[PDB]
Design a protein around this ligand. Structure first.
Ligand SMILES: *[C@@H]1O[C@H](CO)[C@@H](O[C@@H]2O[C@H](CO)[C@@H](O[C@@H]3O[C@H](CO[C@H]4O[C@H](CO)[C@@H](O)[C@H](O)[C@@H]4O)[C@@H](O)[C@H](O[C@H]4O[C@H](CO)[C@@H](O)[C@H](O)[C@@H]4O)[C@@H]3O)[C@H](O)[C@H]2NC(C)=O)[C@H](O)[C@H]1NC(C)=O
Ligand SMILES: *[C@@H]1O[C@H](CO)[C@@H](O[C@@H]2O[C@H](CO)[C@@H](O[C@@H]3O[C@H](CO)[C@@H](O)[C@H](O)[C@@H]3O)[C@H](O)[C@H]2NC(C)=O)[C@H](O)[C@H]1NC(C)=O
Ligand SMILES: *[C@@H]1O[C@H](CO)[C@@H](O[C@@H]2O[C@H](CO)[C@@H](O[C@@H]3O[C@H](CO)[C@@H](O)[C@H](O)[C@@H]3O)[C@H](O)[C@H]2NC(C)=O)[C@H](O)[C@H]1NC(C)=O
Ligand SMILES: *[C@@H]1O[C@H](CO)[C@@H](O[C@@H]2O[C@H](CO)[C@@H](O)[C@H](O)[C@H]2NC(C)=O)[C@H](O)[C@H]1NC(C)=O
Ligand SMILES: *[C@@H]1O[C@H](CO)[C@@H](O)[C@H](O)[C@H]1NC(C)=O
Ligand SMILES: *[C@@H]1O[C@H](CO)[C@@H](O)[C@H](O)[C@H]1NC(C)=O
Length: 454
């Protein structure tokens, strides 16, 4: 079919912080050879994830603030594993320069140019909660409606999160973003802690005011809701103005949600930047080579479309997959490790196509398609490089006319990068741009990134 694409760089929307993943629950250790990954492939995996030149150039790493009093199973151990006795008692903090592999990972990401580290707690330690357990949800003692005999642990949890941040900064790795909940809706056998919008809002202000007293500059986030509409449901709570004249929203830099219980397909009703902070296929299926087959949950194109929809329809500034690389034959990670073997999925190459060319502080700009089989997004980088992502979900190749409209300079060359059943992230021959317009074919069932050269 013939499709006209029109890009208007004068119609500008949200800014981009970028793309990344987590290595939480000891999956950092997989990248560092726990299951036999060779030194060559450890370096290769870190290059795929964090090198702009050789891989995806991911700009966000989401690390877990461990709540556990051991490192058995897949547990993330805490800097304050055992009760100090009472909320006012002196904490016994312990720093291992490790954080379940996440500390060295952070160093090696940063060494390759990673700007943003997002530290997120799944739970306060057990002894700070109503149920005296890091597991099975429960509430931080002292938040509205949730008293405990042992007293009020709110300030203690804020001081604990700040201590985690200081250990990182004093070891040469500043944390840029901090969250204190993960999926507060979920009652599960692993690290988890509940709260509604009002309870979340109450702690945002305590944590915010605590970081101001300590003179620590960091971006606060909430609430990593299990789904987008679950996060939406908490935002009015975060927007309630208390007698102090402030909302939790006044302290937040970023509102965060997951895609599991509902996908980012509409804009959250906050004035802050929004991030999709966790999403993957948890079916247990294994589809590393499939860009398109039947629209399965683990397919390359499914994730190409999740990403494009999140930016174009859900107005996000970042997209963070769940696990980057893990020793498994499931779709829960983007890169499958099989002992000393690296298999990057089409889900990874889809993320890489966006991340490689849509760099931090890029602005999303208007892009329209004359045919629904061909979906488009466009971003302008701060250096002026325009990156246009085109998903052709046609059963046949699409002949595109792409019109960049009025630009700052003039555009003379554009380079296509293709992802499909046949290609990972394949650089094609440059295309001549005449009067800020060019012709291009895109294959059936493909993602193409068109990147302007100078
Ligand atoms: C190191 O950290 C671990 C993990 O956080 C701690 O182990 C937990 O300790 C807590 C506190 O005693 C235990 O909490 C209790 O959990 C019960 C659930 O019991 C069963 O269910 C699960 C899953 O099927 C099993 O893992 C478990 O073994 C049990 O068979 C709750 O029913 C209890 O609730 C009662 O007490 C609370 C708190 O006072 C009340 O609010 C309740 O209403 C109710 O009366 C209780 O919450 C927890 O089970 C332990 N987990 C594990 C995995 O062992 C260690 O305590 C900690 N060690 C140190 C030294 O700090
Ligand atoms: C999509 O997300 C972006 C954030 O990435 C949202 O931008 C935010 O828009 C609001 C409302 O326009 C801005 O607040 C306003 O600020 C101006 C200038 O200070 C002021 O005149 C208004 O009274 C109001 O407070 C906010 O600054 C802006 N946020 C950022 C980070 O730029 C955008 O609104 C979202 N779009 C949709 C449709 O939800
Ligand atoms: C580092 O990782 C690479 C990439 O996984 C490893 O190389 C790959 O090793 C596997 C063997 O486990 C090879 O798989 C074989 O591929 C052929 C097809 O070409 C297939 O017919 C066989 O059944 C088998 O699956 C793979 O080809 C191979 N080399 C590549 C992709 O270049 C490597 O062994 C790891 N270690 C080191 C030290 O590099
Ligand atoms: C691309 O088009 C195909 C149909 O040609 C869509 O595939 C369907 O996807 C759903 C789940 O989204 C499956 O339940 C159906 O079985 C699929 N139909 C097939 C394979 O015939 C696919 O969703 C489209 N992808 C887009 C628009 O991103
Ligand atoms: C790593 O994953 C593969 C594939 O699932 C599995 O068979 C293997 O046993 C795992 N390695 C170790 C050392 O457990
Ligand atoms: C949140 O929880 C508290 C304590 O149960 C309750 O008082 C409050 O009304 C709840 N907030 C909302 C918005 O339901």
């Amino acid at each position: 079919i013939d499709a006209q694409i029109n890009v208007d760089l004068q119609a500008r929307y949200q800014s981009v912080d970028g793309f990344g993943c987590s290595q939480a629950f000891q999956r950092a250790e997989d990248i560092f050879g726990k299951y036999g990954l060779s030194p060559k492939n450890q370096s290769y995996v870190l290059d795929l994830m964090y090198s702009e030149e050789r891989g995806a150039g991911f700009t966000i790493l989401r690390n877990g603030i461990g709540s556990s009093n051991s490192s058995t199973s897949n547990l993330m151990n805490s800097i304050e594993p055992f009760s100090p006795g009472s909320p006012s008692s002196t904490p016994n903090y312990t720093w291992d320069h490790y954080n379940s592999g996440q500390f060295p990972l952070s160093q090696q990401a940063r060494a390759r140019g990673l700007p943003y580290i997002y530290a997120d707690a799944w739970s306060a330690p057990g002894y700070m909660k109503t149920n005296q357990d890091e597991n099975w949800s429960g509430f931080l003692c002292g938040i509205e409606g949730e008293t405990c005999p042992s007293g009020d642990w709110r300030q203690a949890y804020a001081d604990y999160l700040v201590q985690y941040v200081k250990f990182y900064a004093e070891s040469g790795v500043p944390v840029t973003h901090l969250g204190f909940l993960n999926e507060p809706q979920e009652v599960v056998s692993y690290a988890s802690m509940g709260s509604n919008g009002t309870q979340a809002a109450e702690f945002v202000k305590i944590l915010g005011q605590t970081l101001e007293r300590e003179g620590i500059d960091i971006e606060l986030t909430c609430c990593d809701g299990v789904g987008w509409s679950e996060q939406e449901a908490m935002i009015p709570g975060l927007q309630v103005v208390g007698p102090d004249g402030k909302s939790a929203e006044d302290y937040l830099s970023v509102v965060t949600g997951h895609g599991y219980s509902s996908a980012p397909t509409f804009p959250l009703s906050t004035k802050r930047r929004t991030w999709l902070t966790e999403w993957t296929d948890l079916s247990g299926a294994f589809t590393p080579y499939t860009f398109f087959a039947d629209g399965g949950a683990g397919e390359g194109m499914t994730w190409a479309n999740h990403i494009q929809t999140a930016f174009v329809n859900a107005n996000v500034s970042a997209f963070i997959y769940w696990i980057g690389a893990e020793n498994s034959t499931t779709n829960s990670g983007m890169i499958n490790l099989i002992n000393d073997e690296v298999i990057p999925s089409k889900r990874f190459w889809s993320m890489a196509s966006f991340s490689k060319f849509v760099r931090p502080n890029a602005q999303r700009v208007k892009a329209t398609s004359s045919d629904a089989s061909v979906t488009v997004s466009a971003f302008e980088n701060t250096n002026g490089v325009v990156a246009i992502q085109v998903i052709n979900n046609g059963t046949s190749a699409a002949s595109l006319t792409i019109d960049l409209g009025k630009t700052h300079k003039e555009v003379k060359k554009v380079v296509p990068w293709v992802t499909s059943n046949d290609y990972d992230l394949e650089e094609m021959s440059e295309i001549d741009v005449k009067h800020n317009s060019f012709l291009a074919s895109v294959p059936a069932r493909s993602l193409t990134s068109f990147v302007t050269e100078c």
